[model samples]
Each structure stands twice: as C-alpha cells, then as structure tokens.
Target: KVFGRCELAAAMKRHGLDNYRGYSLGNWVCAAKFESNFNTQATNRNTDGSTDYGILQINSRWWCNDGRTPGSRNLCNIPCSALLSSDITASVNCAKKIVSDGNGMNAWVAWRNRCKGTDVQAWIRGCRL
Candidate 1:
C-alpha cells in the first residue's frame, strides 16, 4: 500500500501515533517518508545482509522473519509479510515493541539522520490532522 503524505498522517493519527512512546506523529511521518516513502511493501537490503521491511522498515534480523533469512530473532513474532500489508496495524504494533526495547526512534537510522533534531512539523505540512 502506498499512501500520500496527508493520508499517511491521518492514518498515523488514527493509530494514536500523535504521541506514541514519547515520540510525535511528525517524527513517525518524517521517518516513514525517508524509510519507505509510505509504501507498505517496501523492502531494502542492509549492509549487513539483513533486510528492512514495510513502511517503517522493520529489520528482518531482529523484528520479523522474511522466511529466507536465517537466524532471525523475530522479536515481534510476526512474519515480515505482515508488515507489508495495507492495514498497517501489525507494523505499528511491532514498531511500538521496538521502541519499548529501548532504541526508540533511534532504531530507525532514517529517523536519526533525516527526522531527528529537525523541524518535524513539516512532515505533516498541509495535512488537516
């Protein structure tokens, strides 16, 4: 599923991400833009050979299983395909767990390099939310 910026913002708000785990919706939106451009089916190969999946780009090595990957921790206990769905609930839940595990948004390097310490409000821009 691919979403426009405003559509993604509305979904994030509906998911109560306006203030999730001490992070703002802007933080999430900003990260999502750089992470996967709001494409649920997005996947990327990391330098370590692990893959990142979904809009948040959850890592295959730790959060979810991509089936072909060996030694996946699967701490989220979900199939990587679950993250690539339109519903987004599973991905959001898994992301919460990742943040709870202590990394917070720092778990997403895109967030650190692109969203963090920036005027994140621009991520939402003209969105009604």
Candidate 2:
C-alpha cells in the first residue's frame, strides 16, 4: 500500500511509535518518505547477499532471514517477505526491535541522510493525532 504522509503517521501512531525511543512520529514519517515513499512493497537488494524489505527497508543482514544473508542474526525472527505486506504489523514490530537494539533511527542510512533533524514536525502536519 502506498500511504499518504498523514495516513502513515496515523497508522504508526496507533502502533505506539509516537514517542518511541525519543523519536517523534514525524521522524518516522520522514524516514518512511525517504526510505520507501510509503510503499509497503518496496524493496532493495544489496550488493552483498543481503536484502531490504518493506516500507522501512528492514535489512535481511541482521533483522530478518531471507535464507540468503550469510550469518544473519534474524533478530526480528521473521521472514523478510512478511514486511512486504500492506499490513504493517511486522514492519513496525521489526523496526522497534531495530531501535530497541540501540541502532536507533540511524539503522537506515536514508534516515541519517534525509530525515534527521530536518523539520520532522512538518512531516506530520495536517494530520489528526
């Protein structure tokens, strides 16, 4: 599913990401915009054997098992394909594990390159919280 900015924020908020790990909903919104343009099916294949899947582009290298990323920890203990669903439960759950493990928002380079400290508040404007 391709989400509008507000829709994504609202969905994320319901999943309890508003103040999660000191990051605002908009911080996540902005990162989603940059990482996958709110498309739940978005994916990227790394030059290495790893792959990234879903809206946040969760990596197979450490987060999920694609049966390809060598030595994968599968910390999320889910198949990478699960993240490609329009239903974002797996995506949100895995992302929480990401930040909860201390990678924080920096887990995605797109977040660092695009969303970090860049008026994240605007990303959620016009949305009813």
Candidate 3:
C-alpha cells in the first residue's frame, strides 16, 4: 500500500509519532517519503546483506530478523515479514522503538540526509491533519 502524503501524516499522528522523542510529525513524513516513498512493501538490500524494510526502510541488522542476515540482533523482536504488510502499525510501532533506543530520528540515514536539519514542510505540503 502506498499512502498519500496526507494519509501518511494522519496515520503517524494516530500512532503518536508526531511528538515521539521530540520529533515533529513532518520529520516522520519526510523520512518515510525519502526512505520508501510511502510504499508499505518496499525493501532495499544492502551490500552487506542486510535488508531495509517497509516505508520506514528499517534494517535487518539490528531491528527485525529476516532469518538470512547471518547474525541479526533482532532488537525490535519482530520478524522482517511484519514490516512488509499494507497495515503500517508494525512499521510505526517498530520505528518508535528504533528512535527511542537508537539515536532519535538519526537512526535512519535517509532522515539524516533528507529530513534532518531541513524544513520538511515539502514532505507534508498538502497534508492536513
């Protein structure tokens, strides 16, 4: 499922990601936009054999286990398959944990390069909550 900009924003708001760890809602919207373009089933395979999953593009190295990552910590205690669903609850919930335990929104490199230290308004330009 690919969510529209406003749809993604409102969904994150419902999950309370608007203020999670002091990150504005736009940060979440923007990061996910750059990460996977709001595609729920998106996945990116790293050169190191780790895979990033879902709209948030969460990696398998430390977050979810893909059963093929060789040595996955599974800190999020979730299966990688969970992040590939159209239902984004798992993605949103796991992202909260990633930000909390890791480094704010810096946990995502895409967020750092795109959403971090940026206005991020463009990511949610037409979105009205």
State every prediction's TM-score relative to the real structure: 0.95, 0.96, 0.95
As for lDDT, the candidate ahead, 2 or 3, is 2
In lDDT terms, how accurate is model 1?
Answer: 0.90
Candidate 2, residues 37-89: lDDT per residue as tens digits?
99999989988878989999999988899887887779899999999998999
Model 3 worst lDDT window (10 residues): 120-129
Compared with the true structure, all predictions reach lDDT values of 0.90, 0.91, 0.90
Off by over 4 Å in 2: none
Clash count, one per candidate: 0, 0, 0
Model 1, runs deviating above 4 Å: none
Summarize candidate 3's per-residue lDDT along 1-129 as a digit string, tens digits: 999989999999998998789988999999989999999999999999999999999999998999999877788899998998988898999999999985888889999997888897666677778
Write one digit per residue (lDDT tens) for candidate 1, span 48-129.
7789999999998898988877866899999999999998899888988887788788999999999999999888889998
For residue 98, model 1's alpha carbon misses the true position, in angstroms, by 0.8
Candidate with maximal TM-score: 2
- Give me the displacement of residue 38 in model 3, in angstroms: 0.5
